[PDB]
Write a protein that binds this DNA or RNA. Structure first.
Ligand code: ZN
Ligand code: ZN
Ligand code: ZN
Lengths: 172, 119, 192, 123, 107, 93
RNA sequence: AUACUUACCUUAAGAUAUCAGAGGAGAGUCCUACUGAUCAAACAUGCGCUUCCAAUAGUAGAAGGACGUUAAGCAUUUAUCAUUGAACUAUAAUUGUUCAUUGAAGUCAUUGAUGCAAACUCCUUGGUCACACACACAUACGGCGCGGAAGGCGUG
RNA sequence: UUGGGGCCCUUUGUUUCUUCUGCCUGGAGAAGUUUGACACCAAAUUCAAAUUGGUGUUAGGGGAGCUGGGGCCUUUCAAAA
RNA sequence: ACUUUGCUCGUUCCCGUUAUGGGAAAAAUUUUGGAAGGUCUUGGUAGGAACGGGUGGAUCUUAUAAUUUUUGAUUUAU
RNA sequence: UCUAGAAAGGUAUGUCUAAAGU
């Protein structure tokens, strides 16, 4: 038999046609994505500090740092540090998620634009994007959204949009 | 008969395993796996110089014998001395048995004797 | 089997007159119907006549250049015709089951009460009550919405997209039974 | 380092083995799995080799110094046809007593997990 | 006899497996090594690494790995026109059988 | 039969960038589409290093399983569930 | 959560330490909360057993790295062939030599690669424990403090 | 209960067993400790709110009771000289 | 070896007597095994015992010495 | 000649039906 360690559900006689259909099951994909998000979150969130090996301080060090002065230490209440840690975690996540993307917005009318920046007509990763689009065997998945697709073809030329300013542009 | 069940009975005996490369391993034998995966405790790996002036040793086995890491460096010949090597089974060419063992009690196959007697 | 040379031995040994009951002539023509439905849920069991590859490639040679044996065609047509007429009976049973749902008693009395409730501005009131009765018939449809796949006889639906239909139409059942219908259409055109 | 005399490869999990292979290469990495075919899974292995040029320095006649090519490979699995010997190098990060504490704690957590899963699916 | 040779080996049962092994040793190609184990004649084995050995056979196996005794290894080596003949005497020895080429039986 | 932790780990890395060196010396590195039970892998959009160094590019490749020397999966599969020693499977069917 | 539709699939066999004795069940098998010995595992518990555990009476030190810098360091060594033209040493598929056409394929690197040696910087790891600032030793050295890590050996 | 001295506070989210309150002129107060409690990740319903699915945390030190084992001693009993 | 009769040496005690015998303990003591208790030192302290599995995982045996790992094309050699 | 009763599940999939306010 087979046992999906992430899923926690058994299965009957392990045939590759059953197993491969399980491994692209939507519910298995949700369980696996939760598992790996939580494990990466646990290894980020785990502050393991070095063990402390305290040596006995000497005399002249003790005179110098007993004759410097004493500094005040600041500390906060419980709700303050909880609110601050929520702020710090969302700021680290938006730095990890964002990316500068102005070279894509800035060449938006250029002549060979659809052959490089479209990301579906690229010659290196061109076939992969079309290949991994997914079946969408759900009618209501396509029936949810009612906007336009805006598929820019690879066959586009320099002639269309001859004057870029007159078609209404946006300032950066 | 399967003759690895003879090798399982030799425990804590010094052997001198010839490998397929040419390097020989000399140490206290231990639990031998059923596919002849020998585990040796206190080994003295060595690689014999060919004892002709013009000839070459094995190059692959020489680099392997250094990259065990425990090669005692200042010595002249390729001798590495380490503890606990775990030799994979399909690489042992021949095993030089100790001399003192009594073959006439070791080579009695218990399972063959049982299968001849019970049938 | 377990070691791959065992399975390879199995294949070469089944590779190594040509008449009588020993050889399934229906497989020999091609696509034995007890072979196309081995593992599925419409499984007939095992093909009674044995199947063998040396005989099959000898038949490939014979119908390549030598001759054709029409007794094989009439035997295959008999087995094909009895299976196709049996599954025509079964799709008749399936649409009978849709009818028997459609002429259910309490649903007919409910639609009869709503159709007595259907009884200028009289036409506007009648059309509003008849659109309510049309939505009652469509509520009975929203309980089911079943059409019948005309080849295999299994149920289908139209609210579902083309892609889950494409998931159905590349089946073992539906491809096997399409192959049966196509050899039946070919032999009934050719014999007539 | 000293390894126990009766310690097969099933017992040396999370040690830092030094797996020799058929080519003179050596994969110094932390072991974490193995198999019937003896094809390990090394965690942080560093595939070394002695080059064709410096191999004359190992030829039999201060000390000798060899410059090897450390090439970092993260979480390899090996193919067991290639392996030639395994030698232990370093002990684990944890002790034995600490691994005992952590193993009892993991088994306790698994039994609580299955208890909650069973009593949730009965509800 | 015929019933165990003709069938594939996965259709035999356990008593027929052991009977087949006894048949393969007693009436077969390894009957050479078995006759030399009983009759105490020295064998000459040509290993795959161009070492020839000469010994007596205490036991053998289905893989042709064998426990020898009074082993006399004989190999030749050369680098160019310089060439010597070498000899090594080993008392008791286990030969892993995947290296053998031709077991011979001395007249 | 049973596969054990390495071949099952290789099946856990279907979809991600792996880097494998054959026994002839070559090094292929791409997205791993379908591995199999005998470590027989496919690789899509690969960057193929020949043994003397000449790197080329090729769309898909199917190595024989027997020629692989190692396979370098991503780092996060250290935390894969099959490495958990004390596991509590619920119930057989 | 419930329900229906459709797809895919339905399990290699045997065993759980050995030897030996005693007893029994219609020559062999099977069994004994039967009996001895051997092996193995766990748990305890021990050895004058072996190895290792970082200055403050000071600004140090050990083991391991650097996929760190000086650094284009110092010394060497490489950078495609053909068909022809003009000349050309020349057994070759005009090879050698300068210039060009045409033709095969053609990882990048030449601040590279290979060899050699040093200096500086930065990481990770631990008992930074307790007592003491002392005159020991041929059977060479009270190994006669509390622990911790790893191995050896013995018993229950 | 108070006062003084030494050492540590990197315990960096100022004791890290959790929640709430709280602090460097201080080292504190309450509540809780496994058919549970708590922290967090994901998603769709168009803020939060809610449910469903996952990953974790639930600690360290000392003391009375009962108990497994070892060493020494005393008393008794059976056996060997 | 049992058995009896007297002599001699002798562990301890008594008696005829401190020559030496008679009687008793067949002893004082040492070792091994068991119970009780003293004290020291180390560990555990919420789950454990019996039974049932068309129960999971390990290990072994056999298919398995025939192209995918373990019964050889990596000592570069003619 | 020695008495034939085939499983009953698992995962994947869409659709229906439904449960929510401020
Ligand atoms: Zn799953
Ligand atoms: Zn047929
Ligand atoms: Zn259909």
């Amino acid at each position: 038999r087979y046992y999906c360690e992430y899923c926690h559900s058994y299965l009957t006689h392990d045939t590759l046609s059953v197993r491969k259909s399980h491994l692209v099951g939507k519910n298995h994909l949700r369980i696996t994505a939760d598992y790996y998000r939580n494990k990466a979150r646990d290894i980020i969130n785990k502050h393991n500090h070095k063990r402390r090996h305290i040596g006995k301080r000497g005399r002249k060090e003790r005179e110098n740092s007993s004759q410097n002065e004493t500094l005040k230490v600041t500390c906060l209440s419980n709700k303050e540090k909880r609110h601050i840690m929520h702020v710090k975690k969302m700021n680290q996540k938006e730095l990890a998620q964002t990316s500068i993307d102005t070279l894509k917005l800035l060449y938006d009318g250029s002549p060979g634009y659809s052959k490089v920046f479209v990301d579906a007509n690229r010659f290196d990763i061109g076939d992969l994007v079309k290949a991994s689009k997914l079946p969408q065997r759900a009618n209501e998945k396509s029936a949810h959204h009612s906007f336009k697709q805006t598929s820019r073809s690879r066959d586009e030329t320099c002639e269309s949009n001859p004057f870029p300013r007159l078609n209404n542009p946006k300032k950066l | 008969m399967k003759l690895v069940n003879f090798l399982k009975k030799l425990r804590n005996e010094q052997v001198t395993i010839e490998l397929k490369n040419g390097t020989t391993v000399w140490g206290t034998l231990q639990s031998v796996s059923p596919q002849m995966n020998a585990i040796l405790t206190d080994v003295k790996l060595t690689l014999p110089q060919p004892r002709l002036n013009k000839l070459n040793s094995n190059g692959i086995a020489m680099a392997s014998l250094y990259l065990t890491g425990g090669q005692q460096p200042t010595a002249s010949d390729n001798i590495a001395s380490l503890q606990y090597i775990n030799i994979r089974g399909n690489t042992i060419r021949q095993i030089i048995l100790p001399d003192s063992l009594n073959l006439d009690s070791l080579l009695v196959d218990q399972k063959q004797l049982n299968s001849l007697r019970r049938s | 089997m377990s070691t791959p040379a065992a399975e390879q031995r199995k294949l070469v040994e089944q590779l190594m007159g040509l008449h009588d009951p020993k050889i399934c002539k229906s497989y020999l023509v091609g696509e034995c119907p007890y072979d196309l439905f081995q593992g599925t849920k419409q499984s007939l069991g095992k093909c009674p006549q044995m199947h063998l590859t040396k005989h099959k490639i000898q038949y490939e040679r014979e119908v390549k250049q030598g001759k054709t044996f029409p007794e094989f065609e009439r035997e295959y047509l008999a087995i094909l015709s009895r299976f196709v007429n049996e599954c025509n009976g079964q799709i008749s049973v399936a649409l009978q089951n849709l009818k028997h749902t459609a002429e259910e008693r309490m649903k007919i009395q409910q639609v009869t009460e709503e159709l007595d409730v259907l009884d200028l501005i009289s036409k506007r009131k009648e059309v509003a009550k008849r659109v309510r009765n049309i939505t009652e018939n469509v509520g009975q449809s929203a309980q089911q919405k079943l059409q019948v796949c005309e080849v295999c006889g299994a149920y289908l639906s139209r609210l579902d997209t083309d892609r889950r239909l494409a998931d159905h139409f590349l089946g073992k059942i539906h491809l096997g039974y399409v192959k049966m219908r196509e050899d039946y259409d070919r032999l009934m055109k050719n014999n007539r | 380092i000293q390894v126990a005399h009766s310690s097969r490869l099933a017992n040396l999990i999370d040690y830092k083995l030094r797996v020799l292979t058929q080519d003179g290469r050596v994969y110094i990495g932390q072991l974490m799995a193995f198999d019937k075919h003896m094809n390990l899974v090394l965690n942080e292995c560093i595939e070394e080799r002695v080059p064709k040029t410096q191999l004359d320095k190992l030829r039999p006649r201060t000390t000798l110094n060899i410059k090897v090519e450390k090439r970092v490979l993260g979480l390899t699995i090996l193919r067991g046809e290639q392996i030639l010997s395994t030698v232990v190098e370093d002990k684990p990060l944890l002790s034995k007593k600490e691994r005992l504490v952590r193993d009892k704690k993991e088994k306790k957590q698994a039994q609580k997990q299955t208890k909650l899963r069973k009593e949730k699916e009965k509800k | 006899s015929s019933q165990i040779i003709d069938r594939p080996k996965h259709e035999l049962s356990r008593a027929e497996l052991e009977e087949l092994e006894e048949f393969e040793f007693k009436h077969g190609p390894m009957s050479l090594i078995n006759d030399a184990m009983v009759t105490r004649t020295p064998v000459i084995i040509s290993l795959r690494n161009n070492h020839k050995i000469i010994a007596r056979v205490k036991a053998f196996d289905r893989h042709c790995n064998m426990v020898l005794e009074n082993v006399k290894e004989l190999w030749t080596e050369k680098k160019g026109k310089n060439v010597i003949n070498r000899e090594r005497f080993i008392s008791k020895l286990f030969l892993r059988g995947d290296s053998v080429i031709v077991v011979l039986k001395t007249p | 039969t049973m596969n054990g932790i390495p071949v099952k780990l290789l099946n856990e890395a279907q979809g991600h960038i792996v880097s494998l060196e054959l026994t002839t010396g070559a090094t292929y590195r791409g997205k791993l589409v379908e591995s199999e039970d005998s470590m027989n892998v496919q690789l899509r959009d690969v960057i193929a290093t020949e043994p003397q160094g000449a790197v080329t590019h090729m769309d898909q490749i199917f190595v024989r399983g027997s020629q692989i020397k190692f396979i370098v999966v991503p780092d996060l599969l250290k935390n894969a569930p099959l490495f958990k020693k004390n596991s509590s499977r619920p119930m057989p069917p």
